[PDB]
């Protein structure tokens, strides 16, 4: 099994963020998941005296 691809599991002194992307892709990483929401453009038009 390619150890270097699962770096963050084998290498103990490795921060959970570092990745050796340019050399070899590592297929176990930390992903950021979140849920925004997009409300429609609302506006209340008032008249100038």
């Amino acid at each position: 099994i390619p150890v270097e691809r699962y770096n963050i599991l084998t290498n103990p002194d490795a921060p959970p963020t570092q990745i050796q992307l340019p050399e070899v892709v590592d297929l176990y990483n930390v992903v950021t998941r979140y849920a925004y929401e997009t409300p429609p453009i609302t506006a209340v038009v008032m008249g100038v005296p």
Partner: protein
């Protein structure tokens, strides 16, 4: 009615969907405009939705 945009809602149980636009998590539109001097809300939907029931 809604005390945020002064919009009148026919069924008070549907106020949650309206306040979701203002951003209140109470418990398909693209643009919603309200006129102060008159009662004529104007809303927008994308060009291909439905029978286009009084919507821009």
């Amino acid at each position: 009615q809604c005390h945020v945009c002064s919009a009148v809602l026919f069924s008070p149980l549907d106020l949650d969907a309206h306040v979701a636009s203002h951003g209140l998590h109470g418990n398909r539109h693209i643009t919603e405009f309200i006129s102060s001097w008159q009662n004529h809300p104007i809303v927008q939907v994308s060009a291909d939705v439905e029978n286009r029931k009084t919507a821009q």
